[PDB]
């Protein structure tokens, strides 16, 4: 018919133009969904190197020291 499918394997770019013209509701959904994982893979190390690094983690619990006990004084009874 007037604007049928030319096939992804018979010209990718021509298929992408056809889809943006006749089926935007899928094309821009694919573009949205591909723009996240791909940018996360590619842009993240740039942001870590040049803009700012990754934050130091939060405590999450009492930070029990990795040592042995020390004998103290002060504040005793009496």
């Amino acid at each position: 018919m007037i604007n049928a499918n030319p096939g992804f394997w018979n010209g990718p770019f021509r298929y992408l133009r056809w889809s943006a013209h006749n089926r935007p509701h899928l094309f821009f959904a694919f573009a949205i969904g591909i723009a996240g994982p791909v940018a996360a893979l590619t842009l993240t190390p740039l942001r870590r190197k040049y803009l700012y690094p990754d934050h130091s983690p939060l405590p999450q619990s009492y930070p029990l020291p990795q040592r042995a006990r020390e004998q103290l004084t002060g504040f005793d009874d009496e």
Binding site: I2, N3, R17, A20, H21, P24, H25
Partner: protein, 47 residues
């Protein structure tokens, strides 16, 4: 001038009666992103 067989010079079709052709997605003088924006932001609706 002309002799007609089961017809007339009135019933002869208008000169341009044959509509040109439906345009396809190619031969569209409006880029895909323009009509995409009008498709997703509902232009004529807001108007």
């Amino acid at each position: 001038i002309n002799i007609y067989a089961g017809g007339s010079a009135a019933a002869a079709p208008p000169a341009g009666f044959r509509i040109h052709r439906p345009a396809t997605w190619e031969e569209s003088e409006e880029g895909a992103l323009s009509k995409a924006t009008k498709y997703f932001l509902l232009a004529e609706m807001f108007r």
